Design a protein around this ligand. Structure first.
Ligand SMILES: [Ca+2]
Ligand SMILES: [Ca+2]
Ligand SMILES: [Ca+2]
Ligand SMILES: [Ca+2]
Ligand SMILES: [Ca+2]
Ligand SMILES: [Ca+2]
Ligand SMILES: [Ca+2]
Ligand SMILES: [Ca+2]
Ligand SMILES: [Zn+2]
Length: 455
């Protein structure tokens, strides 16, 4: 008993729900359950000088360490200049989210020390690291030989960069999501894939995400939604990161390669961690149909891909700009600025007084409950175009319709449409409860007609 516009919003908002169903015999785990699974060894660095932060030093080894030859690791080599630069962006991506700092220098008052280097012999792997409770705590080692060259050219979005972020995650105390010729079949929970954690080994295709674009597949460079909860559980959240207004995506002001898009063919795979301010997800440069959800902990389908963008638990992102495609935009309980751009968009501000822009195209502004837009905290539709855009109240009315009148009559379902020509301001007031006063209000820039309302 709802329009198709509201059903699309509602289906998308629950599409990646977790924790309440099986997937092919595996239990779906919430983010908090994963945070405990990823930290189940109990190993972590300690705050030895009690200053409230894990302060670690690291060194790119230039010579084989003491005892290296008996390790069975083959030829030693130091990191190249490109491996160092990438390793520093990976370390920064972890320090952004949790209260751990990494400074290049000799083991000195440090809570711990890390080393990075290359080896040539394969022992079953591309790279390996030790947890912080081991006698080789802080070490991580990367394979480089004539048959495996991926670690020589790490770059944003490729597996060499992901491998760095992943091995640093182990040096911080994170384990693989499962105790692992293993495959996704050995996963313990359904979300053990690289759409939720960079610690997993399994392709995101197992959980349905589409990360491939123009024939090629990508890898998240930085910690993903579950990784952020796991490392924040060990060391605390870093609330100073990006604490002023920030833009992610196109026109990014985040200053991180994995949060920036500069063309419509870019493959973004990221989870947003942000410590404060009035922030915007800007995806205006894509022309594919996108589905954008501002709810904390949720996933969006951006740039022609699916399940590739998420917002970390605990973060409030306020604004979102869609692209030239027909998009879905879901706001959260704060006051949001939501812009559809070209295309026929469906926009749902949710709680709070939102500022809605449909852009060109026939857009639908969707209202799922009376508290979405009340006389004291009413949405405004800034570019309402009568005859083209629609205001949709069917989730509330269940298609019972409205009674349009000039003054409240005292019956539930009465509605008044007015227009103030000197300020070019329209409004829709509805008395859903029936006491002859408005319980619901939406305002617009531009006249609104009775036929622009779906109820
Ligand atoms: Ca410390
Ligand atoms: Ca911010
Ligand atoms: Ca914010
Ligand atoms: Ca659009
Ligand atoms: Ca809102
Ligand atoms: Ca539009
Ligand atoms: Ca429009
Ligand atoms: Ca609202
Ligand atoms: Zn690993």
């Amino acid at each position: 008993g709802t329009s198709s516009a509201f059903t699309q919003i509602d289906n998308f908002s629950h599409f990646y729900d977790r924790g309440d169903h099986l997937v092919n015999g595996k239990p779906s785990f919430t983010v908090d359950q994963v945070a405990d699974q990823l930290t189940r060894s109990g190993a972590s660095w300690h705050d030895l000088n009690n200053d409230g932060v894990i302060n670690l030093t690291y060194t790119f080894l230039t010579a084989p360490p003491v005892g290296y030859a008996s390790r069975g690791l083959g030829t030693f080599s130091q990191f190249s200049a490109l491996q160092k630069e990438q390793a520093k962006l990976s370390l920064e991506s972890w320090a952004d989210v949790a209260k751990v700092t990494f400074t290049e220098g000799p083991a000195a008052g440090d809570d711990g020390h890390q080393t990075f280097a290359n080896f040539s012999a394969s022992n079953g792997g591309a790279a390996f690291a030790y947890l912080p409770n081991s006698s080789r705590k802080g070490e991580s080692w990367y394979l480089i030989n004539k048959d495996y060259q991926v670690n020589k050219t790490p770059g944003e979005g490729n597996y060499g960069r992901q491998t760095l972020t992943h091995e640093i995650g182990h040096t911080l105390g994170l384990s693989h999501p499962g105790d692992y010729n293993p495959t996704y079949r050995d996963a313990v929970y359904a979300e053990d894939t690289r759409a939720y954690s960079v610690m997993s080994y399994w392709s995101e295709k197992n959980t349905g995400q589409v990360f491939t674009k123009t024939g090629e597949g990508a890898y998240a460079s930085a910690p993903l939604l579950d990784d952020i909860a796991a490392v924040q559980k060990l060391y605390g959240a870093n609330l100073e990161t990006r604490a002023d207004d920030t833009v992610y995506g196109f026109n990014s002001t985040a200053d991180r390669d994995f949060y920036s898009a500069t063309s419509s063919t870019d493959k973004l795979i990221f989870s947003v961690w942000d410590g404060g301010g009035n922030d915007t997800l800007d995806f205006s440069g894509f022309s594919q149909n996108q589905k954008i959800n501002l709810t904390a902990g949720s996933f969006s389908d951006v740039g022609g891909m699916t399940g590739n963008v998420s917002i970390a638990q605990g973060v409030t992102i306020e604004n979102a700009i869609g692209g030239s495609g027909n998009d879905l935009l879901i706001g959260n309980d704060a006051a949001n600025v939501l812009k559809g751009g070209a295309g026929n968009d469906i926009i749902y501000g949710g709680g709070g007084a939102d500022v809605l822009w449909g852009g060109t195209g026939s857009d639908t502004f969707v209202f799922g409950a009376v508290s979405d837009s009340t006389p004291k905290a009413a949405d405004i539709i800034k570019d309402f175009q009568s005859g083209f855009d629609k205001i949709d109240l069917t989730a509330i009315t269940k298609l019972g319709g409205l009674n349009f009148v000039d003054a409240f009559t005292g019956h539930a379902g009465d509605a008044i449409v007015s227009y103030h020509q000197a300020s070019n301001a329209g409004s829709l007031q509805v008395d859903f409860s029936g006491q002859g006063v408005a319980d619901f209000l939406v305002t617009t820039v531009g006249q609104v007609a009775t036929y622009d309302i779906v109820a």
